[PDB]
Design a protein around this nucleic acid. Structure first.
Lengths: 384, 51, 148, 238, 28, 108, 89, 121
RNA sequence: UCAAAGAGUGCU
RNA sequence: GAGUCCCAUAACCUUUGUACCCCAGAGUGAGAAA
């Protein structure tokens, strides 16, 4: 007695019409069962009549929640009414018995079916998938399922990008990488410009300062009193380098390099300057993000130290689950927490293993417990 | 990187034009991928430093 | 790929430490017949013989075989259908109940066998850790059951 | 034993997608979809192949009952490269990542879980594996997440409940293929502690017969686990 | 058979239908 | 079921010959093109263009029958199956192509 | 690769003869043949296992074989038996 | 809904506290969140008992992760001070673990409480 | 290549 | 005549300099103070 079938896809809602009713007497015999697997036989049973794709991602999750609770969405109410005749009562097949009462309330003229005969058809509609759509644009179901899976799954947990903690791990890995490259490129700037004016490389040991001073002092021949004041403004004249660089620049052994050679050092030094500036920026981002994610750990020990501890465990969840002893050795290779000295380290390690928990398993962690946790570490400090 | 500069968030992918970066057949793939993508939304603080 | 079936973890050398009260017994067709000959009703015969609650179990082959016996053995068929007798489903082509039973006791070491057929008692005896039930004299007899 | 500096000798297993690492010790080993990291702190091999650096992950039979089944010598496994797999009871990626390693990028693993608290780690692990999809939902009600699952060659059940046979049944009818695979892990203590270990396993083999699974083999997981076995079956709807 | 040309609901299912219906009732 | 479609074309073919609009050889040529199309339509790899190539064909045949009706019979409409046979077929071509290919909004 | 290195060949021999490597360790009887497709690998420990399952960099070598030499206990075990085997021979 | 879930009622709390004292006398009790954590790591525990009134409760939700990942049943009791009195120890106790020993004299009554815990979950 | 014979896949 | 296709654009060892570590490590698990 089945005429219409409601199927529901990640790309949309699909309604089917049942041309022929399979032998309900012989449902369990093999030959009718093989027809379900066979596409040629199944196409003779039903044929697609409606497909209404969801408008986009947001609407799909809203329906995915409604269908999970056996509710009729506005989109669902749209496709049925356009299709089911008003009519004694039109018979509809639905996979869910719980959805049945909801459909009946909206449409008094439809009687729902969820018996094994309906389940047999629903299985075969699903078995062929996009083949039954006769080429109607259904996207790709396997991909669409996977997207709604993260979307439908994550919704019930109330996970947040606030809970997300790997940004610290990327920031630390990027930060140390920046430092090595800032240093590595910077030694070159001393070599490239060292040929032209080697004495200056000794005068300004600070590599970041040296790159800036090379940028203005490109040619050591160019030396003016106003230029001396300009380079004097850089850093301070307390070290006296401003007078030394002039005096050294008047009289030096450095062999002049070409204009193209001088074009590279300032540009390549400019590259070093940008990375140092970005490393400063990324460092501040790392500082701010921990206070949001791990206020207790960041307050207890510090931002940079706390992040390095999290990266060692592989995640904030990993850090929390470890026992107190393991956390102590998790930072015992770079001395993060560092006979009486060891007692403070283990004591602080136990507290660090603690504040890691309050950050990880709280939806909006606060710093109230981190502060009272740190003073307890502080008090212990003066006793020993 | 140029894609990340032209578009910051996948919502921008639907309307943002990637012609100068990508050919015609490639640029439509990222647009279709964007709406069907699997990833989560990111904050502007996250967007700023990635840019 | 070569297959060497494991020896059951319920077997200590040749002593089966898993079969404990209440027991489960598989009934062979002859056992119902010989039970009727001795006027020994089915469930108490294990109760008094084994001093434990017993859960009789019959296979589709045994149910099939009792049916093909004919009108001469109606009461044997009925008695297999007493409610306290549960039924064991089978997923193999043959209706030969002897081969069905040996597989199950080979397969699984939680059953007692109830039979008096000669070909069967020798085969099951070779299987370790399998108690054997038979009807002889005036009541049933249990051979390979340490708890008795 | 397997100490950091030593070298090992990695070869395929009888089953596709599974490898053995020889040496002074033999390790059940499989490759990494996300090289350079471990999901549950498991140990990993590195192989230099033309040169690209391919990585492998060790299977611990004690932690993963499926790995214990391999050590026990399961005859046939439906989990294989290029097969859809629907794994129930997804506490975390301790075994799902391993089941993933078998199927490959072409296949997917449909991981099902009930409780939220493990799901967060399962979702996080799923990000590193683009083929793993977490369906954190009650497996007792497959209809809630019928929205999420395309069809599956084999269903694996890690669910430890007394009514697991019903959970496996309802999922199998909806999603499993005719002649499809079913693998179930049984803990007799969870189902019925009153009766011996063995008899529970006899009863469990029964249900699979009424809801139309023809079961194929069982394997007790000694010495890796007590009171356990892995029953494998084929779903004969006919 | 259900047809888009003729309404089969017999009541305003959307919020637009009631709004237009009120004007139709109010008009004449 | 290729022959089934061809057989429904026989009565109008007979009507065309009976009225004198088309000679037997001319009628034979028309059937040959109809037969070739019908095999194309019922086969694998059939595309919506095959419906469009067929649908245009009897449309031309419709025009020629109308012209030959005035040129030979000198009648606007001869009361026989030939008048509405082609038009009924044209709708009968369309519905299969639409059912076979509901995607093509152009063919709708 | 064809014309494989002597080092890889020797490592394969060690596993085929791994039964005799240690006195207190025994194996299941197995006829081991060289696999048709194969790679050599190194076994990376975790950070938390620094003390438990990690030897020093100096003990980490290129081959399975030459580490077996660095184990003094293995060498003395090999030395004593060869003498017994030659004496009976 | 609460992070403190499931919470044993008045009765079930009593039999659980009966376990902890009797286990304590038999040296089968590891008490505290930290030594509860390792017992899960070694897989040597029947079940882990925790206090729902801990200040904050947060400091013990690392344990259920390990338990449910390891398929170890667990329960919360309303009072930590009552739990500590059961541990045989002069201070409040927030978590406790009963260790796996089939050679224990109190096997049956532990497995008795085991079954009720599994039903509660 | 043809030439004769098998065994799977797609699809009406 | 004769291997790019096992990074000589490299691996490993030695020496030197810089910064940390010598508490146990799946660390232990009820005393400490008087």
């Amino acid at each position: 007695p089945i005429e219409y079938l409601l199927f529901e896809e990640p790309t949309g809602y699909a309604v089917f019409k049942v041309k022929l009713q399979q032998d309900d007497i012989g449902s369990r015999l093999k030959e009718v069962q093989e027809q379900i697997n066979d596409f040629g036989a199944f196409t003779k049973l039903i044929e697609l009549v409606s497909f209404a794709p969801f408008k986009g991602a947001a609407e799909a999750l809203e329906n995915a929640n409604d269908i999970s609770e056996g509710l009729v969405s506005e989109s669902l109410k749209a496709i049925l009414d356009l299709n089911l005749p008003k009519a004694k009562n039109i018979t509809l097949a639905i996979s869910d018995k719980n959805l049945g009462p909801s459909i009946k309330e909206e449409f008094p003229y439809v009687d729902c079916i969820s018996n094994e005969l309906a389940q047999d058809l629903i299985r075969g509609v699903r078995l062929h998938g996009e083949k039954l759509f006769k080429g109607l644009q259904s996207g790709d179901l396997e991909r669409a399922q996977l997207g709604l899976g993260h979307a439908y799954s994550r919704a019930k947990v109330k996970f947040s990008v606030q809970k997300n903690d790997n940004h610290i791990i990327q920031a630390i890995a990027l930060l140390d990488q920046l430092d090595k490259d800032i240093n590595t490129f910077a030694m070159r700037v001393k070599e490239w410009y060292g040929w032209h004016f080697p004495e200056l490389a000794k005068l300004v040991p600070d590599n970041y300062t040296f790159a800036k001073l090379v940028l203005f002092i490109k040619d050591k021949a160019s030396l003016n009193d106003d230029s001396l004041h300009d380079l004097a403004a850089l850093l301070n004249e307390d070290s006296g380098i401003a007078q030394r660089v002039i005096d050294n620049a008047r009289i030096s052994m450095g062999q002049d390099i070409s204009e193209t050679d001088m074009e590279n050092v300032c540009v390549f030094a400019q590259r070093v300057a940008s990375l140092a500036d970005y490393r400063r920026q990324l460092y501040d981002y790392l500082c701010e993000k921990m206070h949001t994610v791990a206020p207790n750990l960041s307050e207890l020990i510090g931002e940079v130290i706390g992040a390095r501890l999290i990266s060692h465990a592989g995640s904030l969840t990993n850090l929390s689950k470890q026992a107190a002893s393991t956390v102590q050795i998790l930072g015992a290779e770079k001395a993060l927490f560092r006979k009486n000295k060891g007692r403070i380290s283990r004591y602080l390690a136990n507290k660090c293993s603690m504040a890691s928990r309050i950050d990880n398993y709280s939806e909006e962690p606060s710093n109230v417990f981190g502060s009272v946790l740190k003073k307890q570490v502080e008090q212990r400090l003066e006793f020993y | 990187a140029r894609i990340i500069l032209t578009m910051g968030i996948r919502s921008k992918a639907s309307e943002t034009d990637l012609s100068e970066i990508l050919p015609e057949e490639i640029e439509e793939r990222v647009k279709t991928a964007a709406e069907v993508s699997m990833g989560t939304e990111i904050t502007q603080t996250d967007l700023d430093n990635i840019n | 790929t070569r297959n060497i079936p494991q020896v059951s973890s319920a077997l200590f050398f040749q002593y089966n430490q898993a079969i404990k009260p209440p027991y489960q017994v598989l009934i062979d067709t002859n056992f119902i017949n010989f039970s009727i000959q001795k006027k020994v009703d089915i469930v108490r015969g294990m109760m008094d013989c084994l001093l434990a609650k017993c859960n009789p179990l019959i296979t589709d082959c045994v149910m099939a075989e009792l049916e093909k016996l004919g009108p001469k053995y109606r009461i044997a068929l009925k008695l297999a259908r007493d409610p306290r007798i549960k039924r064991l489903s089978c997923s193999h082509k043959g209706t030969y109940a002897d081969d069905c039973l040996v597989h199950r006791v080979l397969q699984h070491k939680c059953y007692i066998v109830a039979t008096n057929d000669a070909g069967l008692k020798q085969r099951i005896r070779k299987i370790p850790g399998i108690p054997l039930m038979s009807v002889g004299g005036h009541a049933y007899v249990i051979e390979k059951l340490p708890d008795v | 034993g397997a100490r950091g500096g030593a070298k090992v000798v990695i070869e395929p297993h009888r089953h596709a997608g599974v490898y053995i690492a020889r040496g002074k010790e033999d390790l059940l080993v499989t490759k990494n979809m996300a090289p350079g990291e471990s999901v549950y702190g498991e140990k990993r091999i590195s192989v230099e192949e033309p040169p690209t650096k391919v990585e492998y992950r060790v299977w611990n039979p004690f932690r993963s009952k499926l790995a214990a089944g391999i050590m026990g010598g399961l005859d046939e496994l439906f989990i294989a490269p290029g097969k859809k797999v629907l794994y129930l009871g997804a506490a975390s990626g301790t075994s799902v990542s391993h089941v993933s390693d078998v199927v490959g990028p072409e296949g997917v693993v449909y991981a099902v879980e009930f409780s939220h608290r493990p799901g967060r780690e399962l979702i996080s692990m799923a990000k590193k594996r683009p083929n793993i999809i977490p369906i954190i939902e009650d497996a007792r009600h497959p209809q809630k997440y019928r929205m999420l699952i395309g069809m599956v060659d084999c269903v694996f059940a890690d669910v430890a409940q007394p009514d697991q046979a019903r959970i496996i049944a309802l999922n199998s009818h909806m999603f499993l293929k005719d002649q499809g695979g079913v693998v179930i892990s049984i803990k007799a203590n969870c189902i019925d502690s009153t009766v011996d270990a063995e008899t529970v396993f006899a009863r469990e083999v029964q249900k699979l017969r009424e809801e139309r699974i023809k079961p194929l083999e069982q394997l007790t997981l000694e010495p890796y686990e007590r009171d356990h076995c892995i029953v494998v079956g084929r779903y004969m709807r006919s | 058979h259900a047809s888009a040309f003729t309404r089969t609901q017999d009541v305003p299912q959307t919020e637009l239908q009631e709004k237009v219906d009120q004007v139709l009732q109010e008009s004449n | 079921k290729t022959r089934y479609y061809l057989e429904q074309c026989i009565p109008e073919m007979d009507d065309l010959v009976e009225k004198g609009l088309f000679t037997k050889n001319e009628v034979s040529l028309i059937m040959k093109k109809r037969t070739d199309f019908e095999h194309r339509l019922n086969s694998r790899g059939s595309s919506i263009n095959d419906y469009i190539k067929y649908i245009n064909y009897e449309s031309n045949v419709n025009k020629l029958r109308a012209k030959r009706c005035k040129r030979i019979l000198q009648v606007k409409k001869t009361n026989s199956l030939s008048d509405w046979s082609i038009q009924q077929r044209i709708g009968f071509i369309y519905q299969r192509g639409t059912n076979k290919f509901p995607q093509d909004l152009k063919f709708w | 690769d064809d014309n494989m290195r002597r080092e890889v060949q020797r490592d394969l021999l060690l596993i085929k003869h791994r039964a005799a490597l240690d006195p207190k360790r025994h194996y299941k009887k197995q006829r081991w043949e060289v696999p048709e497709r194969f790679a050599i690998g190194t076994i990376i420990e975790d950070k938390s296992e620094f003390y438990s399952s990690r030897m020093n960099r100096k003990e980490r070598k290129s081959t399975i074989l030459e580490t077996l030499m660095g184990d003094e206990a293995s060498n003395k075990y090999f030395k004593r038996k060869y003498n017994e085997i030659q004496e009976k021979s | 809904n609460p992070k403190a879930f499931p919470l044993a009622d008045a009765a079930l709390t009593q039999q659980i506290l009966d376990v902890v004292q009797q286990a304590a006398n038999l040296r089968q009790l590891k008490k505290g969140a930290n030594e509860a954590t390792k017992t899960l790591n070694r897989g040597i525990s029947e079940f882990i008992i925790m206090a729902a009134d801990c200040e904050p409760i947060e400091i013990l939700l690392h344990l259920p992760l390990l338990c449910e990942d390891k398929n170890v049943p667990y329960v919360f009791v309303p009072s930590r001070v009552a739990l500590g009195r059961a541990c045989g120890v002069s201070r409040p106790v927030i978590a406790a673990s009963i260790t796996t020993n089939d050679a224990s004299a109190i096997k049956t009554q532990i497995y008795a409480v085991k079954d009720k815990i599994e039903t509660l979950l």
